[PDB]
Design an enzyme around this catalytic site. Sequence first.
Site, PDB file in Angstrom:
ATOM      1  N   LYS A  51      10.796 -12.459   2.260  1.00 29.88           N
ATOM      2  CA  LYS A  51      11.906 -11.787   0.159  1.00 29.88           C
ATOM      3  C   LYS A  51      10.425 -13.177  -0.413  1.00 29.88           C
ATOM      4  CE  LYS A  51      15.235 -11.168  -2.920  1.00 29.88           C
ATOM      5  NZ  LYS A  51      14.574 -11.899  -3.974  1.00 29.88           N
ATOM      6  N   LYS A  63      16.791  -5.634   5.979  1.00 30.20           N
ATOM      7  CA  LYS A  63      16.179  -4.955   6.818  1.00 30.20           C
ATOM      8  C   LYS A  63      14.975  -5.406   7.641  1.00 30.20           C
ATOM      9  CE  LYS A  63      16.530  -0.532   4.974  1.00 30.20           C
ATOM     10  NZ  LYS A  63      16.897  -0.262   4.305  1.00 30.20           N
ATOM     11  N   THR A  92       3.788  17.243   9.532  1.00 31.63           N
ATOM     12  CA  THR A  92       3.582  16.957   8.070  1.00 31.63           C
ATOM     13  C   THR A  92       2.361  15.891   8.347  1.00 31.63           C
ATOM     14  OG1 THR A  92       5.098  14.291   7.974  1.00 31.63           O
ATOM     15  CG2 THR A  92       5.516  16.488   6.278  1.00 31.63           C
ATOM     16  N   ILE A  97      -0.040  20.557   5.527  1.00 24.61           N
ATOM     17  CA  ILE A  97       0.757  20.023   5.523  1.00 24.61           C
ATOM     18  C   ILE A  97       1.221  19.392   5.118  1.00 24.61           C
ATOM     19  CG2 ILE A  97       3.467  20.692   7.002  1.00 24.61           C
ATOM     20  CD1 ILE A  97       1.458  22.592   9.099  1.00 24.61           C
ATOM     21  N   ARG A 140      -8.789   8.375  16.966  1.00 24.46           N
ATOM     22  CA  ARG A 140      -9.733   7.414  15.965  1.00 24.46           C
ATOM     23  C   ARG A 140     -11.357   7.682  16.094  1.00 24.46           C
ATOM     24  NH1 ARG A 140      -7.180   4.842  12.099  1.00 24.46           N
ATOM     25  NH2 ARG A 140      -9.085   2.941  12.270  1.00 24.46           N
ATOM     26  N   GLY A 180     -10.668   6.022  10.610  1.00 23.68           N
ATOM     27  CA  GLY A 180      -9.896   7.469  10.509  1.00 23.68           C
ATOM     28  C   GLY A 180     -11.106   9.188  10.774  1.00 23.68           C
ATOM     29  N   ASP A 181     -11.786   8.401   9.493  1.00 25.21           N
ATOM     30  CA  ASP A 181     -12.502   9.640   9.442  1.00 25.21           C
ATOM     31  C   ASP A 181     -13.921   9.040   8.730  1.00 25.21           C
ATOM     32  OD1 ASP A 181     -11.784   8.907   6.443  1.00 25.21           O
ATOM     33  OD2 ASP A 181     -11.305  10.767   6.013  1.00 25.21           O
TER      34      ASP A 181
HETATM   35  O1  LIG Z   1      -4.516   7.685  -1.862  1.00 21.95           O
HETATM   36  C1  LIG Z   1      -5.866   7.306  -1.742  1.00 21.95           C
HETATM   37  C2  LIG Z   1      -6.742   7.541  -0.359  1.00 21.95           C
HETATM   38  C3  LIG Z   1      -8.177   7.110  -0.677  1.00 21.95           C
HETATM   39  N1  LIG Z   1      -8.354   6.260  -1.548  1.00 21.95           N
HETATM   40  C4  LIG Z   1      -9.765   5.383  -1.559  1.00 21.95           C
HETATM   41  C5  LIG Z   1      -9.951   4.429  -0.832  1.00 21.95           C
HETATM   42  C6  LIG Z   1      -9.919   4.883   1.034  1.00 21.95           C
HETATM   43  O2  LIG Z   1     -11.098   3.645   1.527  1.00 21.95           O
HETATM   44  C7  LIG Z   1     -10.900   6.017   0.767  1.00 21.95           C
HETATM   45  C8  LIG Z   1     -11.690   6.937   1.569  1.00 21.95           C
HETATM   46  O3  LIG Z   1      -9.923   7.546   1.632  1.00 21.95           O
HETATM   47  P1  LIG Z   1      -9.529   7.234   3.470  1.00 21.95           P
HETATM   48  O4  LIG Z   1      -8.355   8.321   3.498  1.00 21.95           O
HETATM   49  O5  LIG Z   1     -11.077   8.223   3.832  1.00 21.95           O
HETATM   50  N2  LIG Z   1      -9.293   6.148   3.862  1.00 21.95           N
HETATM   51  P2  LIG Z   1      -9.961   4.661   4.479  1.00 21.95           P
HETATM   52  O6  LIG Z   1     -11.469   5.535   4.497  1.00 21.95           O
HETATM   53  O7  LIG Z   1     -10.281   3.770   4.076  1.00 21.95           O
HETATM   54  O8  LIG Z   1      -9.467   4.457   6.012  1.00 21.95           O
HETATM   55  P3  LIG Z   1      -9.461   5.458   6.910  1.00 21.95           P
HETATM   56  O9  LIG Z   1     -10.043   5.272   8.331  1.00 21.95           O
HETATM   57  O10 LIG Z   1      -7.899   6.168   7.476  1.00 21.95           O
HETATM   58  O11 LIG Z   1     -10.298   6.367   6.686  1.00 21.95           O
HETATM   59  O12 LIG Z   1     -10.913   6.928  -1.116  1.00 21.95           O
HETATM   60  C9  LIG Z   1      -7.617   6.025  -2.884  1.00 21.95           C
HETATM   61  O13 LIG Z   1      -8.380   5.122  -3.451  1.00 21.95           O
HETATM   62  N3  LIG Z   1      -6.069   6.890  -3.053  1.00 21.95           N
HETATM   63 MG   LIG Z   2     -11.555   7.233   5.385  1.00 20.54          MG
HETATM   64 MG   LIG Z   3     -10.774  11.047   3.689  1.00 25.44          MG
HETATM   65 NA    NA Z   4      -0.059  16.638   6.837  1.00 18.60          NA
HETATM   66 NA    NA Z   5      10.009 -10.886  -3.000  1.00 15.57          NA
END
Ligand SMILES: O=c1ccn([C@H]2C[C@H](O)[C@@H](COP(=O)(O)NP(=O)(O)OP(=O)(O)O)O2)c(=O)[nH]1
Ligand SMILES: [Mg+2]
Ligand SMILES: [Mg+2]
Ligand code: NA
Ligand code: NA
Length: 326
Positions: A51, A63, A92, A97, A140, A180-181
Amino acid sequence: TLNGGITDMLTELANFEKNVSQAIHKYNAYRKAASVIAKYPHKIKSGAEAKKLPGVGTKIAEKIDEFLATGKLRKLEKIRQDDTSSSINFLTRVSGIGPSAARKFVDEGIKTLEDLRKNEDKLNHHQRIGLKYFGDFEKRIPREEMLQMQDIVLNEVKKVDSEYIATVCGSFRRGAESSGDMDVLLTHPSFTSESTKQPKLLHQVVEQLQKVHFITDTLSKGETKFMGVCQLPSKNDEKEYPHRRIDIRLIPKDQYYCGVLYFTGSDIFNKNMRAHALEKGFTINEYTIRPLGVTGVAGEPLPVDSEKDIFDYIQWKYREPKDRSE
DNA sequence: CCGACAGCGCATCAGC
DNA sequence: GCTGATGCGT
DNA sequence: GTCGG
Ligand SMILES: O=c1ccn([C@H]2C[C@H](O)[C@@H](COP(=O)(O)NP(=O)(O)OP(=O)(O)O)O2)c(=O)[nH]1
Ligand SMILES: [Mg+2]
Ligand SMILES: [Mg+2]
Ligand code: NA
Ligand code: NA
Ligand SMILES: [Cl-]
Ligand SMILES: [Cl-]
Ligand SMILES: [Cl-]
Ligand SMILES: [Cl-]
Ligand SMILES: [Cl-]
């Protein structure tokens, strides 16, 4: 991950509040707490200790104590049992979705991977491609594969017009050993906040990448944002690489820095920075940083020549991409 | 207490 | 067809 | 769910 157990619990709880409860503010609350605890450099010993961190209040502190004593949380134990919550949460996970369509599908009796597959005629384009690559999108991307994808994207972009500038951002630019992308920021001198001298700027690139079979599918496409699928080519007799999600964002060249700052993230870092910007009297988006007048209305764009200039405006020491993974 | 919680592109819908 | 509200991912 | 004024 000193406190892996707690951050997972908090993340699960956040996923639950957004997917099932459709209570987005609670979702973000949990996400912030998980984020602040994730970076806490000690192995938390009590809720009270937790906290102390900003973002963790009485409820979450409570929690954490329940979690430390038993190694679990009753509130989540039950949630895992509830069939409806388990189904909505699962759906989701299919790109396209969200909370509403998820609950809607369950209402119709569609609640398993199998169910979606036999009801393909009930999904929009994005949800269909999302189901198509359900498994792949869960995997990944090793940085090594990211470096290989980068070569193609940059080299294929150069072939279209030597003046295009493609910069991979996202977790890649932050130095992650897995993403992740792939997120690509695109700029061209013909498209600025001043004028658009060339039409089909993003299209041309998307087209060129499709021609070489890099881009395989399209989730959505506009004049400045592309959300789709791509795949690294494989050698003879070699097993194929999984299909990967790709986002391409075309930003006005004179607004590159606000663009690269945004696309590098993370999403929570952006949130924390954009919140702090407000408190300092500014508003920041992917295009500019503007001051906020008394009325509460954003003024004209402040000049920017580096990402650091934006940090300076809001009185924050510059932080390298690698240190923005919040 | 209680308002605020980052900001926005694209797909899809409703109302017209 | 248009604009606006909503969903979704971001 | 947490926070600042
Ligand atoms: O809600 C969001 C989502 C993404 N973003 C920005 C930051 C993020 O690093 C970038 C690319 O979006 P991704 O969803 O690809 N995320 P990131 O590359 O950080 O992580 P991951 O490895 O999951 O793709 O867009 C925001 O500002 N707000
Ligand atoms: Mg990304
Ligand atoms: Mg992206
Ligand atoms: Na989804
Ligand atoms: Na706090
Ligand atoms: Cl909420
Ligand atoms: Cl648990
Ligand atoms: Cl800029
Ligand atoms: Cl703007
Ligand atoms: Cl985006």
